[PDB]
Design an enzyme around this catalytic site. Sequence first.
Site, short mmCIF file in Angstrom:
data_model
loop_
_atom_site.label_atom_id
_atom_site.label_comp_id
_atom_site.label_asym_id
_atom_site.label_seq_id
_atom_site.Cartn_x
_atom_site.Cartn_y
_atom_site.Cartn_z
N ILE A 1 0.82 -1.20 0.00
CA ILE A 1 0.00 0.00 0.00
C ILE A 1 0.86 1.26 0.00
O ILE A 1 1.93 1.29 0.60
CB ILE A 1 -0.92 0.04 1.24
CG1 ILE A 1 -1.80 -1.22 1.26
CG2 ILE A 1 -1.79 1.30 1.21
CD1 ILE A 1 -2.67 -1.38 0.04
N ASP B 1 5.71 -9.77 4.64
CA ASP B 1 5.77 -8.32 4.45
C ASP B 1 6.50 -8.08 3.12
O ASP B 1 7.36 -8.88 2.73
CB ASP B 1 6.55 -7.67 5.60
CG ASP B 1 5.74 -7.60 6.89
OD1 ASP B 1 6.35 -7.39 7.96
OD2 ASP B 1 4.51 -7.75 6.84
N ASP C 1 8.41 -5.23 2.28
CA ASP C 1 9.70 -4.55 2.40
C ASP C 1 10.77 -5.53 2.88
O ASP C 1 11.38 -5.37 3.94
CB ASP C 1 9.56 -3.34 3.34
CG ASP C 1 9.05 -3.71 4.72
OD1 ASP C 1 8.17 -4.59 4.83
OD2 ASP C 1 9.52 -3.10 5.70
N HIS D 1 10.69 -14.76 15.92
CA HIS D 1 11.10 -13.36 15.79
C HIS D 1 12.61 -13.27 16.04
O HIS D 1 13.11 -13.73 17.07
CB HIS D 1 10.34 -12.51 16.80
CG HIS D 1 10.50 -11.03 16.59
ND1 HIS D 1 11.72 -10.39 16.64
CD2 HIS D 1 9.58 -10.07 16.33
CE1 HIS D 1 11.54 -9.10 16.43
NE2 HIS D 1 10.26 -8.88 16.24
N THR E 1 7.25 -9.40 24.09
CA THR E 1 6.33 -8.27 24.05
C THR E 1 4.90 -8.65 23.67
O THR E 1 4.31 -8.06 22.77
CB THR E 1 6.83 -7.17 23.08
OG1 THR E 1 7.02 -7.73 21.77
CG2 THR E 1 8.15 -6.59 23.57
N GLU F 1 0.42 -8.85 15.08
CA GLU F 1 1.42 -9.74 15.65
C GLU F 1 1.04 -10.23 17.05
O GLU F 1 1.35 -11.36 17.41
CB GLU F 1 2.78 -9.03 15.69
CG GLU F 1 3.92 -9.86 16.26
CD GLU F 1 5.27 -9.20 16.04
OE1 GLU F 1 5.84 -9.36 14.93
OE2 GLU F 1 5.75 -8.51 16.96
N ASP G 1 17.35 -9.45 10.23
CA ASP G 1 17.69 -8.06 9.96
C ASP G 1 19.17 -7.97 10.31
O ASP G 1 19.53 -7.78 11.47
CB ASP G 1 16.88 -7.10 10.84
CG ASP G 1 17.14 -5.64 10.50
OD1 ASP G 1 18.27 -5.33 10.06
OD2 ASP G 1 16.23 -4.81 10.67
C1 LIG Z 1 13.69 -6.37 23.72
C2 LIG Z 1 14.15 -5.65 22.45
O1 LIG Z 1 15.22 -5.05 22.41
N1 LIG Z 1 13.35 -5.83 21.40
C3 LIG Z 1 13.66 -5.31 20.05
C4 LIG Z 1 12.47 -5.56 19.12
O2 LIG Z 1 11.37 -4.73 19.52
C5 LIG Z 1 12.82 -5.32 17.66
O3 LIG Z 1 11.86 -5.84 16.72
C6 LIG Z 1 10.55 -5.24 16.78
O4 LIG Z 1 9.75 -6.07 17.64
C7 LIG Z 1 8.38 -5.62 17.74
C8 LIG Z 1 7.61 -6.52 18.71
O5 LIG Z 1 8.18 -6.43 20.02
C9 LIG Z 1 7.73 -5.70 16.36
O6 LIG Z 1 7.75 -7.06 15.90
C10 LIG Z 1 8.52 -4.83 15.38
O7 LIG Z 1 7.97 -4.97 14.07
C11 LIG Z 1 10.00 -5.25 15.36
O8 LIG Z 1 10.77 -4.38 14.53
C12 LIG Z 1 10.70 -4.76 13.14
O9 LIG Z 1 11.40 -6.00 12.93
C13 LIG Z 1 12.78 -5.94 13.32
C14 LIG Z 1 13.43 -7.31 13.17
C15 LIG Z 1 13.52 -4.90 12.47
O10 LIG Z 1 13.56 -5.31 11.10
C16 LIG Z 1 12.83 -3.54 12.59
O11 LIG Z 1 13.44 -2.62 11.67
C17 LIG Z 1 11.34 -3.67 12.27
O12 LIG Z 1 10.68 -2.42 12.48
C18 LIG Z 1 14.16 -5.93 17.29
C19 LIG Z 1 14.52 -5.45 15.88
O13 LIG Z 1 14.53 -4.02 15.86
O14 LIG Z 1 15.19 -5.53 18.20
C20 LIG Z 1 14.93 -5.99 19.53
O15 LIG Z 1 16.00 -5.45 20.30
#
Ligand SMILES: CC(=O)N[C@@H]1[C@@H](O)[C@H](O[C@@H]2O[C@H](CO)[C@H](O)[C@H](O)[C@H]2O[C@@H]2O[C@@H](C)[C@@H](O)[C@@H](O)[C@@H]2O)[C@@H](CO)O[C@H]1O
Length: 264
Positions: free
Chosen positions: A63, A130, A132, A152, A164, A222, A245
């Site tokens: 989108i 996804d 991207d 994850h 989370t 999620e 990532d």
């Molecule tokens: C405890 C901690 O440090 N958690 C971090 C995560 O929050 C980061 O991933 C993100 O997680 C949330 C759910 O908690 C959600 O899934 C977000 O989409 C996710 O971020 C995305 O996916 C990641 C893998 C990256 O590609 C990010 O750019 C995306 O926006 C992770 C990754 O940032 O780090 C952990 O430290």
Amino acid sequence: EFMVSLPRMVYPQPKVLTPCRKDVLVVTPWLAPIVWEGTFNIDILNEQFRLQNTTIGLTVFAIKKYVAFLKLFLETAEKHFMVGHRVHYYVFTDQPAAVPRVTLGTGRQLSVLEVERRFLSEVDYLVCVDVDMEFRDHVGVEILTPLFGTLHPGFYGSSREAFTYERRPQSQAYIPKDEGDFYYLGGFFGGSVQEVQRLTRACHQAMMVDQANGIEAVWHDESHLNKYLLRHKPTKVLSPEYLWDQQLLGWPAVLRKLRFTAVP
Ligand SMILES: CC(=O)N[C@@H]1[C@@H](O)[C@H](O[C@@H]2O[C@H](CO)[C@H](O)[C@H](O)[C@H]2O[C@@H]2O[C@@H](C)[C@@H](O)[C@@H](O)[C@@H]2O)[C@@H](CO)O[C@H]1O
Ligand SMILES: [Cl-]
Ligand SMILES: [Hg+2]
Ligand SMILES: [Hg+2]
Ligand SMILES: [Hg+2]
Ligand SMILES: [Hg+2]
């Protein structure tokens, strides 16, 4: 259903007294395999699924500005996703004309849906990811099963307490601190069309209930996906190799391959 026999095949004999990996868990407590490089022989699996003339549907939503990611997404999928099998791409977008003209291999097709029984008669499995992202290595039939979730990349080594999950009892996605197997990614899940539709149906109904109660899960889709997979155990769990990532998490020794990654 009736499955014809496999043909003669020559490969290394599995070793009963030699574990696949000694560094990671390769099977869940409910006996679902956890897919890591080294746990599967892709030749055997390809045979099994080809003998079934398996068709895999791959759905993505693009989108607004996200349509700019389609080109790389589809091009890399052509090189790494289910190569050798029938693939049907389903691109849901608000800009049909902006979808790039990507050259596809034989037996692979793409449908543009502008923004369901159609899925039941067109594909055997549905993979939801996804847009991207880009494929950097093999992503094949080893993931196919009735229902699968993906670990994850930022929580695979965390205690459930740190996951989370939605923690408010007022939410349908609520999961207490003493519950939870893993933290699955909302960006990569799938399974049979039937199981994927059941999951989507359950999550939409749950989100509607939350909506009416004036509450929104901490991590939206999620959060509900995690509640669903907690209550309906996936028949296979994909390792972080399937959604990584590198810029943010690097390349741990535990990852022998980075197959599907975020685009910086
Ligand atoms: C405890 C901690 O440090 N958690 C971090 C995560 O929050 C980061 O991933 C993100 O997680 C949330 C759910 O908690 C959600 O899934 C977000 O989409 C996710 O971020 C995305 O996916 C990641 C893998 C990256 O590609 C990010 O750019 C995306 O926006 C992770 C990754 O940032 O780090 C952990 O430290
Ligand atoms: Cl999707
Ligand atoms: Hg092994
Ligand atoms: Hg889907
Ligand atoms: Hg759900
Ligand atoms: Hg969901």
